[PDB]
Amino acid sequence: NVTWFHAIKRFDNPVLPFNDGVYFASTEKSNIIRGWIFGTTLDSKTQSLLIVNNATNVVIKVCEFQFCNDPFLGVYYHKWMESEFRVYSSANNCTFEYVSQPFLMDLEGKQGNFKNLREFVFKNIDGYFKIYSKHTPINLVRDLPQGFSALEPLVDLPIGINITRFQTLLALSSSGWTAGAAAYYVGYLQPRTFLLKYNENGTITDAVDCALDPLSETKCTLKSF
């Protein structure tokens, strides 16, 4: 089961618990939900992680920053226009800030054969926050497609704080408002044993979930595919 959130007035952007990591493959353009928040307070009380991953770079910023009830830029672009500014309410204090390479996702305006499956694995554990990522050129815009692809690590940060909740940051009055055609996926990670097939080059070509079904458990016990 993977929860599907409709990104928009109808802000389907609640504070979701961060139980043992999250999987964040999504299909949309302009990056809509560029930023993410991870903390236990998320109201400047604690140094809540605010990752950006904007079109420029992932500006990691773990600071005791205030997140308003609706911290969104409110840009009704292509309906590019702006309504207010609450993405960055105020930074009461801070703990650390890192800036990565000025990369750029494929958020740019393009639908075609939708190749913007930017599948991400945000895992927080043992005082660390890891951003394993991959980009897959899929052909279907409907719900997550069928296929296999191993996710490479992208950043590894020794933050050391405790987090018990997360949230997603939306940059996007109520009369005749066109609901944004954007959505994302939240999948949860739990402790499991996986049998991974390292091919000749060192890349995982396939995996077996040892608790999915009796056949997979047999494969795991025998150590064979």
Partner 1 sequence: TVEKGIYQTSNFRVQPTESIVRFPNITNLCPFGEVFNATRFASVYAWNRKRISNCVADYSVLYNSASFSTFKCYGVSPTKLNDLCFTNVYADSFVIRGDEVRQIAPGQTGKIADYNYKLPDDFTGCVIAWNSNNLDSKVGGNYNYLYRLFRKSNLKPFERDISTEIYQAGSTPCNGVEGFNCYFPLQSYGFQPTNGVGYQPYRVVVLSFELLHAPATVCGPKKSTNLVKNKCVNFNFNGLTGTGVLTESNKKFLPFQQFGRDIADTTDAVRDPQTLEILDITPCSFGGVSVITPGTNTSNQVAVLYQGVNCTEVPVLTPTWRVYSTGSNVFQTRAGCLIGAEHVNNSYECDIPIGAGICASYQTSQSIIAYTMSLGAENSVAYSNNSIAIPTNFTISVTTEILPVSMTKTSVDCTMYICGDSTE
For the chain, give percent helix, strand, coil, nearest 5. Answer: 5, 30, 65
- Determine if 164 is a binding residue for partner 1 (CB under 8 A): no
CB of 91 within 8 A of CB of 188?
Answer: no
Tell me if residue 155 falls in helix, strand or coil: coil
- Determine if 17 is a binding residue for partner 1 (CB under 8 A): no
> According to CB under 8 A, which one of 82, 160, 179, 212 is a site residue for partner 1?
160
Query: Which two tokens mark 76?
Result: 């009704």
Residue type, 52: V
Task: Please tell me the count of residues contacting partner 1 according to CB under 8 A.
Answer: 10
Minimum distance between the CB of residue 130 and partner 1, rounded to whole angstroms?
A: 10
- Determine if 97 is a binding residue for partner 1 (CB under 8 A): no
For residue 126, the tally of other CB atoms under 10 A from its CB is 6
What is the DSSP secondary structure assignment for residue 216, as one 8-state letter? H
Stretch that binds partner 1, among 102-110, 149-157, 168-176, 181-189 (CB under 8 A): 149-157
What is the DSSP secondary structure assignment for residue 152, as one 8-state letter? B
Chain residues 32-71 in contact with partner 1, contact rule CB under 8 A: none
Chain residues 193-222 in contact with partner 1, contact rule CB under 8 A: 201-203
By CB under 8 A, name the binding residues for partner 1.
Answer: 127, 152-153, 156, 158, 160, 162, 201-203
